[PDB]
Amino acid sequence: QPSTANGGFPSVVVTAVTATTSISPDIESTWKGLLAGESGIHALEDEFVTKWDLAVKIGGHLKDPVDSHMGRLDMRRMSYVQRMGKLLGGQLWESAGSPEVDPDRFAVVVGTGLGGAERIVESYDLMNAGGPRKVSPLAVQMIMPNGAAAVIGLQLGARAGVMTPVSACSSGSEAIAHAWRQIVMGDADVAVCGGVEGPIEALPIAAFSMMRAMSTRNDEPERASRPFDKDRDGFVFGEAGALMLIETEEHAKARGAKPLARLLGAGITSDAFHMVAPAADGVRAGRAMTRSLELAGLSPADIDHVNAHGTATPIGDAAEANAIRVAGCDQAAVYAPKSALGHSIGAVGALESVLTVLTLRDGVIPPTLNYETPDPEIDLDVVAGEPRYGDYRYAVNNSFGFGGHNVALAFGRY
Amino acid sequence: QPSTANGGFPSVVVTAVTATTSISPDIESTWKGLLAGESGIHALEDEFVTKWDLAVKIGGHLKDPVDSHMGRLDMRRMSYVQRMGKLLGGQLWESAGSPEVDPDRFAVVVGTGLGGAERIVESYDLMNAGGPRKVSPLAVQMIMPNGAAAVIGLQLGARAGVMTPVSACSSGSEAIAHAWRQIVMGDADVAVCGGVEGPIEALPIAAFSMMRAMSTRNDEPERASRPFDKDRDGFVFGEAGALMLIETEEHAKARGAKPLARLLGAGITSDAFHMVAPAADGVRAGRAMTRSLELAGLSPADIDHVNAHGTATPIGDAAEANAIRVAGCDQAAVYAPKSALGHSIGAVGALESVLTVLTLRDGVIPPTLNYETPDPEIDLDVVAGEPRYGDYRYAVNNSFGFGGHNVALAFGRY
Ligand SMILES: [Cl-]
Ligand SMILES: [Cl-]
Ligand code: NA
Ligand code: NA
């Protein structure tokens, strides 16, 4: 049985990371802000909040809007997530030293949750005004959900596959999983992978608010997202996009790249329980964690840290606590970054994978914000109050998305 | 180096197939119709054709509309592709003998190209009339593009992963590729996989017509789709959805299932050349074919049959001819089923994978319709005139989708 530990899979390392968040456009500044206890969540100033008198009046827009970096041409021929992908793809490649890699061994896997939905809705209009020949001959390349991965693959020259997984909140983690598979099966030696997602808008707020999935603690926006806290009342949206560069350790060594961490294994399972709610028993979600350990060659006792999915919904956090127990990982130090960064559906698993890498690199876990009253049904070791410095050797990042899509990624310190 | 031939990968067999097409809701009736030279392509009677005076006035609607099988409840809580997935998923399971499988070893991978786009556009309206609290609390489960795979996984009880790849015309083939990977890596023993796509509508016709990608031979609808013919003038839309059941040969034998064919290997590459046009040299597309042979343990000389992507665009067919040469497969007997069934983006690679299986099972390739004048730049052995009966031992199904996403699937006779 091949595993990373027994050499049956090639060693795969993370060599570069990039992200834009509600705290900062600079991932190292986001990290410093997280360690300092900062929140990206604020009162929403968007006109659509007062227009609709939305029950949710809080969220985290990007600190640095993507389109402040976009000229008129890009604004007209790319969807938002394509522009985000172009921005992050170029930043990542620069952070990696702009390496010259073999295109035929270079893959791109970028997930999204909702996708380029704004250009589809926009293409109807204009046609209803000027007919079919009005429709921008660029419409096809802006409307389909693989558009962001396609842009990045074309931008960076990836000819070993350009893939887009769609699994709601787990899309960005699942993308990293498939990139890892593409390398360990021998199809690629290097891959850009992660997730992108559109900005906070009225329709997603209304759709998820109508499920009672979202916090309405509008008076104290920074205190609203309370993963695993007894007083939690749902998730908060916080915008993000994130990409990482992974490659075989041999490929990194050959080009002088310094690894930030090891990507050791990935598990993908499904609840087949409900179209939006997670299974209360946490069993299939825990088994995604177990599968990542099997492929890494690790035991539950090796796992020092879990970067929780931790959305702060009542049922979601309870399910994940059961999952962590099922996987034998309930002695791990737990961080719930959505406490500070909010939920970004298709991007957030990639963002949290980057955070897991930084936790292993720096030996420190930021505090879970607003964790003030342990929930009795949640008996987890949640890092809180101030950063916990620790000898974290191995970690699992969880992403358990709406629909029961479970992705767990196993990382190790380099 | 593991291969299927050397036992490094477990043997994987196709045990059941289902499809709905412009010829028939019954895959075996579609097959008989193809062999008889039937076309699913007709004059479009939709009001939107005359409303917009579209340049394209032809296409193939499903012979049996999905919603003729859908009650009021399903019509209101599922997107079209979710309803198609539910219909095909139930038909497939019945054709397989309704087996009781281990949920924890059962995966679902279903691709789509455009997805549940109609429910997103629909959710804006109603909110603009009655506000956020009007928005159907079922909106979330109807709007995201993983919705069809989620429905099928919940319907059939798949707990070893529920995945949705998005790669335009290659999505349905890529789904089968990822399902094969999920089994040969040990994550599942059985998987339902394929692709689904919405019906012919005005906006897709206008978007692809504006690229000059579509035939306008409106006077003779059945003669319009002419893959590899000198007089071809673009593709024709033909609706479809298709799923197959794959499982380890040991799993099939244990439950008494009779395999229809073997799924031996899958290659996924990318052109990184252009956002919609394929690379003229066919090199990366050919390498997807080569990769499928490497993983199967086959040589180009083993390939008796290629089920071409064959859209009938001028540049697409020329690129694919180069790809088949690059892969060393230009002595294979070539079929282009879009000649009779048209193009169904996210579903069509799955449909053509089913057809490849039937070709191997029955030792016969249907005629490529409208192939009357070989193109000098296309020197391929295209089956035409009447079905060619032959000793087909191994075959490759190609899907080379817009954006340069190349998927090749290697199948063998059982
Ligand atoms: Cl602590
Ligand atoms: Cl012939
Ligand atoms: Na996480
Ligand atoms: Na084909």
Author numbering:
A (entry chain A), B (entry chain A): 3 to 416
Question: What does the literature reporting this entry say, word for word?
Answer:
The mycobacterial cell wall is adorned with essential mycolic acids, which are synthesized by a fatty acid synthase-II (FAS-II) system that is absent in humans. The FAS-II complex includes one operon that encodes the β-ketoacyl-ACP synthases KasA and KasB and the acyl-carrier protein (AcpM) and a second operon that encodes the ketoreductase (MabA) and the enoyl reductase (InhA). KasA has also been shown to be essential and a vulnerable target in mycobacteria.
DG167 binding stabilizes the KasA acyl channel flaps that are otherwise disordered in the absence of PL or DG167.
